[PDB]
């Protein structure tokens, strides 16, 4: 179906403890393929998916150089931001950056991103037109002017609409067996008596990919959103994902309840009921 590539950058200052921590990770959809850790011995971009290991030394040397440049830029940014907001030098702060592109089923460009956050809050973000910027406060305003004069948006757009999309396609092809797979969820239901008058019905979805999925409970066809416990979709660690929705059922009403599962790998939505 639809696909996307994303790079996540986190930079955390450590006052009096030297250079800031820098961590970069790349994703194709819900699969990480690369990473760089400033505190690692290698000082290189490393593969994190088997299908990227085929990339020669030129790819790794190149990516290593660019991620190092990314790193140095963020180290400076931490100082500039500490100035914008008149903050001391003893406090630890966080800068986060994310950029990437979305493509439809036809693998054609659909949407591009490039966003910054400071201490967990939106700082500056490229708008959907990839031509304008969003700045909430004065600090961000300054940055916006700077980036407007250096025509940053125009260059970022070239990457997001061109390079980003092109290489996203390349990764999809090179890693077809895993990146282009759709694993329908394995579903089952558990039943446990919490007391004499009640029991827990839990609907399971396992070993599915991608991560996007919908799990709901119904009682006689009526949604139970606020009476069902929904856990966050979670990684199994093997590249697949998990999720469950539980509902407390009064003993004797099992038949009234239905679990509904929607996922890319399912032709039609599944309906399950304890019986």
């Amino acid at each position: 179906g639809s696909h996307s590539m994303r790079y996540f950058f986190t930079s955390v200052s450590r006052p009096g403890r030297g250079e800031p921590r820098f961590i970069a990770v790349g994703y194709v959809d819900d699969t990480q393929f690369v990473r760089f850790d400033s505190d690692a011995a290698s000082q290189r971009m490393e593969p994190r998916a088997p299908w990227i290991e085929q990339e020669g030394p030129e790819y790794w040397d190149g990516e290593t150089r660019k991620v190092k440049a990314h790193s140095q830029t963020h180290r400076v940014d931490l100082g500039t931001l500490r100035g914008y907001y008149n903050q001391s030098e003893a406090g630890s702060h966080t800068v986060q950056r994310m950029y990437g592109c979305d493509v439809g089923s036809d693998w054609r460009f659909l949407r591009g991103y490039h966003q910054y956050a400071y201490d967990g809050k939106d700082y500056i973000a490229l708008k959907e037109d990839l031509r304008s910027w969003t700045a909430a406060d004065m600090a961000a305003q300054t940055t916006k002017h700077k980036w407007e004069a250096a025509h940053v948006a125009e260059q970022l757009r070239a990457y997001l609409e061109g390079t980003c999309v092109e290489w996203l396609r390349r990764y999809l092809e090179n890693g077809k067996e895993t990146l282009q797979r759709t694993d329908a969820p394995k579903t089952h239901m558990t039943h446990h008596a919490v007391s004499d008058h009640e029991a827990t019905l839990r609907c399971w979805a396992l070993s599915f990919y991608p991560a996007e999925i919908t799990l709901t409970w119904q009682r006689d066809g009526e949604d139970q959103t606020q009476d069902t416990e929904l856990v966050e979709t979670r990684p199994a660690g093997d590249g697949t994902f998990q999720k469950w929705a539980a509902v407390v059922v009064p003993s004797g009403q099992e038949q009234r309840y239905t679990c509904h599962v929607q996922h890319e790998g399912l032709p039609k939505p599944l309906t399950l009921r304890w019986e």
């Binding site: 660019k66 440049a69 830029t73 990457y159 390079t163 980003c164």
Partner: peptide, 10 residues
Amino acid sequence: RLYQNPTTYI
């Protein structure tokens, strides 16, 4: 593939 253009400063 990382953005290859020199990222401008904040």
